[PDB]
């Protein structure tokens, strides 16, 4: 509803409730992750080769085809599985 | 603004443990193309003229 003959001074810069919305969206972003899956067994040595592609030596492939040992649902047996990652998500640790 | 990844990907499930699934990339079905965006040239020049004004 509209208020007649009234004048209030505002300030968006010293305003509150942008602090509240920032804190609440950060915490609410965090609270949708507690049921989710931690990638503890995936921190592992990745044997990465280039993606199957016509490689140009001047440019770079932005995808690496990485194979690795993955633990299976049984705690005895492990498997070998491959995946595709980006350059920005993997780094080379110091031939092979 | 329009924005796209034109690469057709294959989500592949990997069993980590009991009730633990990792969704990895499988195949790249087709061409390996670069993700990009488009804006209109004319309306962006128009809005830059407005903001300079």
């Amino acid at each position, epitope marked *: 509803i509209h208020l007649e003959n009234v004048t209030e001074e505002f300030n968006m810069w010293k305003n509150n409730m942008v602090e509240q919305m920032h804190t609440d969206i950060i915490s609410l972003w965090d609270q949708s992750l507690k049921p989710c899956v931690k990638l503890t067994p995936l921190c592992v040595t990745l044997q990465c080769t280039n993606v*199957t*592609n*016509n*490689i140009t030596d001047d440019m770079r492939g932005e995808l690496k085809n990485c194979s690795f040992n993955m633990t299976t649902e049984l705690r005895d047996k492990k498997q070998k599985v491959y995946s595709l990652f980006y350059r920005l998500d993997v780094v080379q640790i110091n031939s092979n | 603004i329009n924005c796209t990844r034109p690469n*057709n990907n294959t989500r592949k499930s990997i069993r980590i443990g009991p009730g633990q699934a990792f969704y990895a990339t499988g195949d790249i079905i*087709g*061409d*390996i*193309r670069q993700a990009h965006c488009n804006v209109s040239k004319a309306t962006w020049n128009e809005t830059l003229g407005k903001v300079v004004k």
Partner: antibody
Amino acid sequence: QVHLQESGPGLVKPSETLSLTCNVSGTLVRDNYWSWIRQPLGKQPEWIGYVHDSGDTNYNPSLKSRVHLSLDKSKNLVSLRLTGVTAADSAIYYCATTKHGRRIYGVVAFKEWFTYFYMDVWGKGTSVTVSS
Amino acid sequence: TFVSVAPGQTARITCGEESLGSRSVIWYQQRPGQAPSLIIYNNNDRPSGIPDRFSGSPGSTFGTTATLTITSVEAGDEADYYCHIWDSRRPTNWVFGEGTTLIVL
């Protein structure tokens, strides 16, 4: 009317630089691209390479070091030179005029296109028959 | 490799690896004792001099094999066909595809 006309030795001795020249028919050597294509008996052909003036000197990654394709613009001929004739080199060889094109599948500014090459005419032949 | 139909019938000639990216297949034919002749230079184009019904495959299709659909064959078309694909993902193939012959009854 365009055809071709090869010329070579016929009887080939090993451990020797080999030579071939390709005469023209109407179309001059300066204008169009050129190519050499070899084929054994009862086999699929093996494209030796395409050559042209001004840096267009892309060859086969099978050899990369023992072949030299060029032209003879003083005579309006095409020239191929080879090094190290072996038993696999016993094949009939062809000159050709090739042409190109573009196959575009994405943004042209992102270099998302490649060039094909097609040989519409073909040669007549010269048999490299290795004998020692 | 042979395709044996009556002269005047339909025929297909597959050649090579399954597609990975945007191909540009190029088809040739070999007369015996002569240098070859081009028949197809784009995915489904044809130049002047060779007639129609060398219906190639659409090379913008992913996970397919380059065919060569020839309806109403004849003895004058008898040669050794050759695929020569230009896959966008795989590198440049310098040798041609294998000799896919044709005999006619």
